[PDB]
């Protein structure tokens, strides 16, 4: 399956070689001739007056190989002008042997990414719903208005905004492969590429993602403050957390958009080359991931030190649940993320597929895991729910 971006790359190479032919082919035998031209769909050579000119359908089409016997043609008119209709104001061409271009299926993404799409979409759907319910529950009860509950409420808003931004991304990319945007000799998709809407949605996604990871970092730092300090921490730290979880991701996400116009503005900030520019966003995100993991492990050390004597059946339950969250996030997530600094520069393949599988399924279902963990499974929320019911 030939992807859009790969089609653009091949087309650009077609244009390079094509312009080179335009420059190097010798001029025609006589000045009675219409001029060779590249019309962005084919390189037309000079034409004898009153004759047909043929070129193969341009090979950058994803399906050019299915109609190799087809050709596209122009007519060089007898007045030495290219034939054009008084109407279309643009020169006539016949693309019919290559018209399956409008309705063919060859320009599709790799099916494996479509396999991951249903998974992470379902995970952000259930996470979005349960986070909406749980956020309504913690927000709704005046007796539950804890400071830590407001922190978890901010984490819920971060996961929800993340699921929304990923939904708008899936709508945009789904439209990019739709038959309407993939018009015959598609141009409306290019007009969408020039739009601010093409890039602003993806930048908004980048902010929701970096804000989600930084909010997980605020969650880990808050747990370490409640446990290592054992203090009833105040509002100055809370004002700091509000500045951090929405502020820092803005702080390194804005430059990524500035560079995204200054270079790769033709990419609609979707596909990205120049790996350092992509490190501009992911590298701080890798920092938040690794630091949140290290605070996680340190909290595990604190619980290993402080509960050393007590063992009850509830400790057998919740302690095993801590083994579940460790084996899910500590044992696996940080391995793929810390190695990911090397895993996208190289080491692609089925290993890349397993990497996207574990990371996508993880962060997709982590919002549901946080909704059930910080709300529905909380004991005080259960007894308080049974107080009225």
């Amino acid at each position: 399956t030939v992807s859009l971006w790969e089609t653009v790359q091949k087309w650009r190479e077609y244009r390079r070689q094509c312009q080179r032919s335009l420059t190097e082919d010798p001029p025609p035998a006589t000045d009675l001739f219409c001029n060779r031209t590249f019309d962005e769909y084919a390189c037309w050579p000079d034409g004898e007056p009153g004759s047909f000119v043929n070129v193969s359908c341009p090979w950058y089409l994803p399906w050019a190989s299915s109609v190799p016997q087809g050709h596209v043609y122009r007519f060089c008119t007898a007045e030495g002008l290219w034939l054009q209709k008084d109407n279309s104001s643009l020169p006539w061409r016949d693309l019919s042997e290559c018209e399956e271009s409008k309705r063919g299926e060859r320009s599709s993404p790799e099916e494996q990414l479509l396999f991951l799409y249903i998974i992470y979409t379902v995970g952000y759907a259930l996470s979005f719903s349960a986070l909406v319910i749980a956020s309504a529950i913690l927000l709704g009860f005046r007796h539950l208005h804890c400071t830590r509950n407001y922190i978890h409420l901010n984490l819920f808003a971060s996961f929800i905004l993340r699921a929304l931004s990923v939904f708008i991304k899936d709508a945009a990319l789904k439209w990019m492969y739709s038959e309407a945007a993939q018009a015959h000799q598609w141009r409306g998709l290019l007009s969408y590429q020039d739009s601010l809407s093409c890039r602003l949605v993806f930048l908004f996604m980048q902010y929701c993602v970096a804000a989600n990871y930084y909010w997980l970092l605020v969650e880990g730092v808050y747990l370490y403050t409640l446990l290592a300090f054992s203090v009833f921490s105040e509002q100055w730290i809370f004002r700091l957390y509000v500045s951090i979880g929405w502020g820092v991701p803005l702080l390194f996400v804005v430059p990524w958009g500035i560079v995204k116009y200054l270079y790769e503005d033709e990419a609609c900030w979707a596909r990205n080359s120049n790996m350092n520019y992509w490190l501009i966003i992911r590298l701080p995100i890798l920092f938040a991931i690794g630091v949140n993991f290290l605070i996680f492990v340190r909290v595990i050390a604190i619980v290993v030190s402080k509960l050393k004597a007590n063992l009850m059946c509830k400790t057998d339950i919740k302690c095993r649940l801590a083994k579940s969250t460790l084996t899910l996030i500590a044992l696996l997530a940080t391995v793929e993320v810390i190695f990911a600094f090397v895993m996208d520069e190289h080491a692609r393949g089925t290993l890349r597929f397993i990497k996207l599988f574990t990371e996508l399924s993880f962060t997709s279902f982590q919002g549901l895991m946080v909704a059930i963990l910080y709300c529905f499974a909380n004991n005080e929320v259960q007894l308080e729910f049974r107080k009225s019911w």
Binding site: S3, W5, P109, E110, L113, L116, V166, K169, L173, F202, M205, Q206, V209, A270, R271, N272, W278, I281, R282, D344, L356, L360
Partner: peptide, 8 residues
């Protein structure tokens, strides 16, 4: 999301 979009 950001990485997956590329190959997509």
């Amino acid at each position: 999301x950001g990485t997956f979009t590329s190959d997509x």
